[PDB]
Amino acid sequence: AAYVAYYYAIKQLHQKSVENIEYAKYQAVLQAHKSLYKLLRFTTNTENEDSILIWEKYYFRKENIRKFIKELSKEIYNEGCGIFMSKEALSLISEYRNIVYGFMLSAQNNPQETIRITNRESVERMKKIHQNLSIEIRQAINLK
Amino acid sequence: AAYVAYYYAIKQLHQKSVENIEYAKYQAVLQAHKSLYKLLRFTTNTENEDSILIWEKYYFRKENIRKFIKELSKEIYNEGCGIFMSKEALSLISEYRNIVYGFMLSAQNNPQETIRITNRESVERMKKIHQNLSIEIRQAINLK
Amino acid sequence: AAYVAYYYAIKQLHQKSVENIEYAKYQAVLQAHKSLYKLLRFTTNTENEDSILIWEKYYFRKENIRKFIKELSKEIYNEGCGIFMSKEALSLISEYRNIVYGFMLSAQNNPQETIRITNRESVERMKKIHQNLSIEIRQAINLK
Amino acid sequence: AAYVAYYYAIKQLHQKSVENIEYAKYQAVLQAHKSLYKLLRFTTNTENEDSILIWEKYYFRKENIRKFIKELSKEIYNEGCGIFMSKEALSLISEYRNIVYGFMLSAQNNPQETIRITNRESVERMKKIHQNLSIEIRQAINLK
Amino acid sequence: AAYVAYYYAIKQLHQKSVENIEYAKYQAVLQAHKSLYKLLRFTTNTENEDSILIWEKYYFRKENIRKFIKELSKEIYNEGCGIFMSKEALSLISEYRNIVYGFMLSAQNNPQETIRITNRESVERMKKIHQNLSIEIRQAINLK
Amino acid sequence: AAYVAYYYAIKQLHQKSVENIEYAKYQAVLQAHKSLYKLLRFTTNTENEDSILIWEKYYFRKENIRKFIKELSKEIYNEGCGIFMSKEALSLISEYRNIVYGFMLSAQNNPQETIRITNRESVERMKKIHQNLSIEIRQAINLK
Amino acid sequence: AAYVAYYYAIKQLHQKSVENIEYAKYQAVLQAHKSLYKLLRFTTNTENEDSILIWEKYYFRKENIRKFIKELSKEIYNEGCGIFMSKEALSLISEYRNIVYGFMLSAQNNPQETIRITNRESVERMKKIHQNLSIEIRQAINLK
Amino acid sequence: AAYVAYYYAIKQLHQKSVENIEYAKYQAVLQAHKSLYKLLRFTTNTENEDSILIWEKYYFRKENIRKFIKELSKEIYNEGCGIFMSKEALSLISEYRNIVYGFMLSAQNNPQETIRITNRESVERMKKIHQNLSIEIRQAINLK
């Protein structure tokens, strides 16, 4: 029993470092995701001040894709968010980026803004990413 | 008894790390709701400097709906409030938004500001949302 | 005894979360009321730089009611005070607001500033609200 | 005696929770009085850069009473001092205010600054208030 | 023994909140005296950039007395130092002030700066105050 | 048992002080790497606003190498990152630097921007460094 | 041991916040000396951007003595360093000051800058003060 | 055992106060070295934006020695680094300074920038100092 107690004593305090450090990392994670969430306004399935896609009854793309790409670069790298976010969150963002980026590449000599999307697979996939990404960000700080 | 004591010890400290993270999240929640509350001035059932609806004795809408939508976007996404608020609070805000947004869409070539509302269901629903939303925000930080 | 010990331990530490979070909320309450108190200068029964009512021997209203309404909106909503204040404090403020607001609505084409009040019930009620509100704010942070 | 052991412990841990709030309030009190003390320069019985009363050997009043009233309004209401100060401190300040305010009201078409006081009761009462107020402020933060 | 235990516990924890508050006051005292010390440059018995008295072999007064009085008013009242300093420190400062103030009052139509002091009692008393005041300030924060 | 107790106590508390310093260093490490991560945008294998290499289907270099070198100098030395990063992270950065630096040295009288790379070994090595460096930075703060 | 228990416990706790206050004072001492150290650049026995004395093989004085005196006044009095420094540190600084000050007083109608020192006792004493002062400042914060 | 207990208690708590002061000093040391490290860019054996020595295959000196001396003065004295750094770190910096300073003194009427070094002993010694200094700074904060 005495031997077990001593082990608990060292294991318990030791766990003191984990109690103290784990906290510091959590606080950094909380800020990294708090600042990432705003990026989701571009991926919304509701109308907004900006958005990427506009609903009609359709699904026209906007040139706000340029704003999305710039906000994306700042949050993932310049603000350091990429460190505290999971591989799943990064994968979902990367796929979304390629869908909207691809759209702009096809537009080329874009005949004004607001361009109709005829392949609905891209539309449905963007909506699914929004839901999966919103959940992955929301639960990033909800594990305690 | 000794075996149980060890289990209680581990539960007790382990709970220490949870004691320090739950606190950090609470403080973030408190700030997220403190900054959201101001949005409620637009939904008030009393007279105010601005408001959306004006009482007369009929429930005329104001063009302050534009201020509401802009303040809404900033608080939910740019300031990160959407992370720390419940699904019920978001649902209530979304419904309210659609009622006032719809009103503006009907106005189109709006014949000046201050437009009468003839369908009282929208008026009564907006008031009920104000009460439910005010309570949901108020209790967000009142669970300890 | 053993059952009480571990049961006592769960009741105790657990109370550790309440010991901390309760503290964080208290500090927010203290600031919310510290910033609300200044609003009371408008409701004073003594002379001041501004005030609403001026004593003579009377009770003339001033146009400083406009300053009161603007300060009121900022403190209750923009600064988030409304969250940390009781229903009684809000009820007292709301009644006061309606008394002074009503006065201004009656004035309409106001024949200059400083207008006599002939119905003393409003005068006595405003003074009583000042006393009740001053106490309700003062005791908001005095429960420990 | 298990119940007895449980009692004292609950009283103590509960007292630790109360220990964390009493501290927070003390710190607010300390700042509220630190900023109030400067107001006393106007009530001094010694010569100063400004003061209210000037000694000669008679007790002439200065027009610095206007500075006193403005500083008084700011400290009691705008800075929130009125919350953390006792009724005795407020009573003493209020009486002083009325003595100097009354003086200015009598002056009316004031024949320049520096006006002699012929009723020595006001002079002696102002000095006594200075001493009582200086002590009441000084001891506000000296109870531990 | 049992009676002392619980009685001892009430004496102990209770002291805990009081030990905290004592800490908060100490820190305020430390800052109040740190900012007061600079005032002593005017009372030095060595040469300096400014000083009040200049040594020659004499003891000529400078018009820097005006700087002293202004710095004195700011530190004792505007910065709140007067709260955290002892009666002895205030008495010593007050006497010094009256010696230098008196000198200026005698100068009247001052025949330029740098005026000789012929009564050496004032010179020796100012030096003694410097030493007593320097010690009283230095020990203000040295009691633990 | 007694010998282990006091010996255990010396091992324990002693650690306790080490529980704090380890924490302070961790927090510094976390910030040093948070600010280093942004440097990785230059080494990405995806398209970006800037990047070094552009994908086509060939691996053309950009003159953004100048931005990379300047950002590198600031993060490693001026911001002090070099202290809190491992030898492996520094080795990987140094090799990358020499690959891109060498490229620029070969360009000399560079025939405009966007220059093709014909030796694919450099291309594949840069991609491998990106992956190894991204992991080494990511795990720098993940050891608790 | 029972007698020691209660008395020992009171002595122990009592010490508790005295260790706290000791901490607060230490931190103030650390800052006071951190800001004093820079003053030593003037007393160096090596070449520098400024210095007081320049080595040649000599020992010419510079007019940088004026910079020394001004920096000295600011650090000892305006920044409050004089409180947290020992009598030995102050004595060493005072002697140094008088050596360089005396030099300037002898120069009078100074025949340009860079004046040779012919009495080597002053040169050797200044170097010895530098070493003693450097040690006294360095050890001021090294007693734990 | 009883004697060891109370004796052990005096050894223990006592240490406890010191485990807060040791912490405070560590944090100051960490900052002092974090800000010193940047100085090493001048001593690097790799190419850089500035550097002192440039590699060719040689070892030409640059006039950036002036930048080195100015940065050196600021970090050792004005920022207070000299307090928290070891004698070995200071000795290594001093020797380096004299090597580069000497070089500039020999240059005199310097025939433009970029001057070849023909005595390789200075070149090899500067590189060795870089390695020894880099290690001494790096380990300054790595003893826990």
mmCIF file of N, CA and C in Angstrom, chain D residues 8 12 16 19-20 22-23 26-27 30 33-34 37-38 40-41 44 47-49 138 141-142 144, chain E residues 6 9-10 13 16-18 20-21 24-25 28 70 73 76-80 82-85 97:
data_model
loop_
_atom_site.group_PDB
_atom_site.id
_atom_site.type_symbol
_atom_site.label_atom_id
_atom_site.label_comp_id
_atom_site.label_asym_id
_atom_site.label_seq_id
_atom_site.Cartn_x
_atom_site.Cartn_y
_atom_site.Cartn_z
ATOM 1 N N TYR D 8 -18.260 22.029 9.719
ATOM 2 C CA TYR D 8 -17.162 22.973 9.832
ATOM 3 C C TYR D 8 -16.477 23.123 8.479
ATOM 4 N N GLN D 12 -16.115 26.498 6.246
ATOM 5 C CA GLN D 12 -14.792 26.971 5.866
ATOM 6 C C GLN D 12 -14.644 27.136 4.359
ATOM 7 N N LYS D 16 -14.004 30.291 2.152
ATOM 8 C CA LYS D 16 -12.986 30.543 1.118
ATOM 9 C C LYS D 16 -13.613 31.193 -0.126
ATOM 10 N N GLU D 19 -14.085 34.655 0.738
ATOM 11 C CA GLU D 19 -12.784 35.255 0.785
ATOM 12 C C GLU D 19 -12.449 35.747 -0.598
ATOM 13 N N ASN D 20 -12.785 35.019 -1.665
ATOM 14 C CA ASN D 20 -12.449 35.601 -2.985
ATOM 15 C C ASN D 20 -13.223 36.830 -3.576
ATOM 16 N N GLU D 22 -14.794 39.171 -1.197
ATOM 17 C CA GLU D 22 -14.478 40.285 -0.319
ATOM 18 C C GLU D 22 -13.223 40.976 -0.824
ATOM 19 N N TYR D 23 -12.232 40.203 -1.269
ATOM 20 C CA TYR D 23 -11.035 40.783 -1.842
ATOM 21 C C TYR D 23 -11.349 41.664 -3.043
ATOM 22 N N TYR D 26 -12.849 44.870 -2.010
ATOM 23 C CA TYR D 26 -11.877 45.740 -1.370
ATOM 24 C C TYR D 26 -11.069 46.476 -2.393
ATOM 25 N N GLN D 27 -10.588 45.780 -3.414
ATOM 26 C CA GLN D 27 -9.764 46.469 -4.377
ATOM 27 C C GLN D 27 -10.545 47.592 -5.057
ATOM 28 N N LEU D 30 -10.694 50.523 -2.636
ATOM 29 C CA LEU D 30 -9.431 51.197 -2.538
ATOM 30 C C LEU D 30 -9.264 52.179 -3.674
ATOM 31 N N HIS D 33 -11.750 55.317 -3.288
ATOM 32 C CA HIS D 33 -11.316 56.321 -2.334
ATOM 33 C C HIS D 33 -10.008 56.977 -2.753
ATOM 34 N N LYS D 34 -9.110 56.250 -3.417
ATOM 35 C CA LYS D 34 -7.865 56.869 -3.854
ATOM 36 C C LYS D 34 -8.157 58.063 -4.749
ATOM 37 N N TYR D 37 -9.948 61.259 -2.657
ATOM 38 C CA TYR D 37 -9.081 62.028 -1.779
ATOM 39 C C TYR D 37 -8.657 63.341 -2.393
ATOM 40 N N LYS D 38 -8.338 63.376 -3.675
ATOM 41 C CA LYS D 38 -7.870 64.614 -4.295
ATOM 42 C C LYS D 38 -8.860 65.766 -4.161
ATOM 43 N N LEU D 40 -10.284 66.696 -1.613
ATOM 44 C CA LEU D 40 -10.045 67.329 -0.336
ATOM 45 C C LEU D 40 -9.129 68.499 -0.450
ATOM 46 N N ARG D 41 -8.402 68.661 -1.546
ATOM 47 C CA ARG D 41 -7.537 69.821 -1.565
ATOM 48 C C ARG D 41 -8.375 71.092 -1.459
ATOM 49 N N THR D 44 -9.090 72.163 2.288
ATOM 50 C CA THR D 44 -7.975 72.297 3.211
ATOM 51 C C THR D 44 -7.999 73.558 4.046
ATOM 52 N N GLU D 47 -2.810 76.804 3.167
ATOM 53 C CA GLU D 47 -2.853 77.466 1.878
ATOM 54 C C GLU D 47 -2.508 76.457 0.806
ATOM 55 N N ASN D 48 -2.970 76.718 -0.406
ATOM 56 C CA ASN D 48 -2.756 75.828 -1.525
ATOM 57 C C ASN D 48 -2.742 76.627 -2.822
ATOM 58 N N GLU D 49 -2.554 75.933 -3.937
ATOM 59 C CA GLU D 49 -2.552 76.523 -5.270
ATOM 60 C C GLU D 49 -3.909 77.119 -5.604
ATOM 61 N N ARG D 138 -9.904 58.385 4.914
ATOM 62 C CA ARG D 138 -8.694 57.667 5.286
ATOM 63 C C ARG D 138 -8.952 56.300 5.896
ATOM 64 N N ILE D 141 -10.493 52.324 3.888
ATOM 65 C CA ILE D 141 -9.726 51.205 3.407
ATOM 66 C C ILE D 141 -8.833 50.618 4.489
ATOM 67 N N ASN D 142 -9.079 50.981 5.751
ATOM 68 C CA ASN D 142 -8.209 50.577 6.854
ATOM 69 C C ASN D 142 -8.850 49.637 7.863
ATOM 70 N N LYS D 144 -8.866 46.125 7.859
ATOM 71 C CA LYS D 144 -8.253 44.788 7.880
ATOM 72 C C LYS D 144 -6.815 44.917 8.374
ATOM 73 N N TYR E 6 -11.038 23.541 15.951
ATOM 74 C CA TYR E 6 -12.047 24.275 15.196
ATOM 75 C C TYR E 6 -11.910 25.777 15.472
ATOM 76 N N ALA E 9 -9.062 26.734 13.583
ATOM 77 C CA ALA E 9 -9.441 26.838 12.186
ATOM 78 C C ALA E 9 -10.121 28.182 11.922
ATOM 79 N N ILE E 10 -11.024 28.624 12.793
ATOM 80 C CA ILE E 10 -11.652 29.922 12.529
ATOM 81 C C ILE E 10 -10.614 31.051 12.568
ATOM 82 N N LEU E 13 -8.107 30.407 8.764
ATOM 83 C CA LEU E 13 -8.606 30.755 7.446
ATOM 84 C C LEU E 13 -8.913 32.236 7.357
ATOM 85 N N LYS E 16 -6.509 34.105 6.521
ATOM 86 C CA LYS E 16 -6.259 33.997 5.052
ATOM 87 C C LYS E 16 -6.816 35.138 4.146
ATOM 88 N N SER E 17 -8.095 35.480 4.306
ATOM 89 C CA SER E 17 -8.644 36.602 3.536
ATOM 90 C C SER E 17 -7.953 37.867 3.964
ATOM 91 N N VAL E 18 -7.714 38.042 5.263
ATOM 92 C CA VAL E 18 -7.010 39.213 5.767
ATOM 93 C C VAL E 18 -5.574 39.243 5.276
ATOM 94 N N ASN E 20 -4.662 38.178 2.364
ATOM 95 C CA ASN E 20 -4.778 38.690 0.998
ATOM 96 C C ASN E 20 -4.929 40.229 0.888
ATOM 97 N N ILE E 21 -5.940 40.786 1.523
ATOM 98 C CA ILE E 21 -6.177 42.199 1.568
ATOM 99 C C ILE E 21 -4.938 42.938 2.026
ATOM 100 N N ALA E 24 -2.881 43.427 -0.952
ATOM 101 C CA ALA E 24 -3.356 44.458 -1.875
ATOM 102 C C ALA E 24 -3.058 45.852 -1.375
ATOM 103 N N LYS E 25 -3.199 46.071 -0.076
ATOM 104 C CA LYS E 25 -2.900 47.384 0.418
ATOM 105 C C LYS E 25 -1.417 47.638 0.315
ATOM 106 N N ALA E 28 -0.410 48.933 -3.004
ATOM 107 C CA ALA E 28 -0.776 50.331 -3.209
ATOM 108 C C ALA E 28 0.167 51.273 -2.467
ATOM 109 N N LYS E 70 4.390 73.086 -6.654
ATOM 110 C CA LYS E 70 3.532 72.426 -7.624
ATOM 111 C C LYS E 70 3.677 70.898 -7.584
ATOM 112 N N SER E 73 1.784 69.545 -4.467
ATOM 113 C CA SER E 73 0.337 69.450 -4.589
ATOM 114 C C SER E 73 -0.075 68.242 -5.406
ATOM 115 N N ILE E 76 0.678 64.832 -3.259
ATOM 116 C CA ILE E 76 -0.101 64.558 -2.074
ATOM 117 C C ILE E 76 -1.570 64.383 -2.398
ATOM 118 N N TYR E 77 -2.138 65.249 -3.238
ATOM 119 C CA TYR E 77 -3.550 65.119 -3.514
ATOM 120 C C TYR E 77 -3.897 64.524 -4.854
ATOM 121 N N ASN E 78 -3.393 65.062 -5.958
ATOM 122 C CA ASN E 78 -3.917 64.564 -7.244
ATOM 123 C C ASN E 78 -3.610 63.098 -7.516
ATOM 124 N N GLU E 79 -2.461 62.635 -7.061
ATOM 125 C CA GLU E 79 -2.060 61.248 -7.265
ATOM 126 C C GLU E 79 -2.484 60.343 -6.102
ATOM 127 N N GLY E 80 -3.119 60.920 -5.089
ATOM 128 C CA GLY E 80 -3.597 60.187 -3.928
ATOM 129 C C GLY E 80 -2.538 59.728 -2.928
ATOM 130 N N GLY E 82 -1.374 61.012 -0.242
ATOM 131 C CA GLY E 82 -1.730 61.362 1.122
ATOM 132 C C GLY E 82 -2.437 60.250 1.893
ATOM 133 N N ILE E 83 -3.096 59.325 1.199
ATOM 134 C CA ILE E 83 -3.791 58.213 1.831
ATOM 135 C C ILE E 83 -2.863 57.190 2.460
ATOM 136 N N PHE E 84 -1.765 56.886 1.784
ATOM 137 C CA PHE E 84 -0.903 55.783 2.154
ATOM 138 C C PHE E 84 0.343 56.185 2.894
ATOM 139 N N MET E 85 0.407 57.428 3.285
ATOM 140 C CA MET E 85 1.553 57.922 3.998
ATOM 141 C C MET E 85 1.155 58.283 5.404
ATOM 142 N N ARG E 97 7.426 72.771 3.811
ATOM 143 C CA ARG E 97 6.695 73.651 2.925
ATOM 144 C C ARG E 97 6.588 75.025 3.510
#
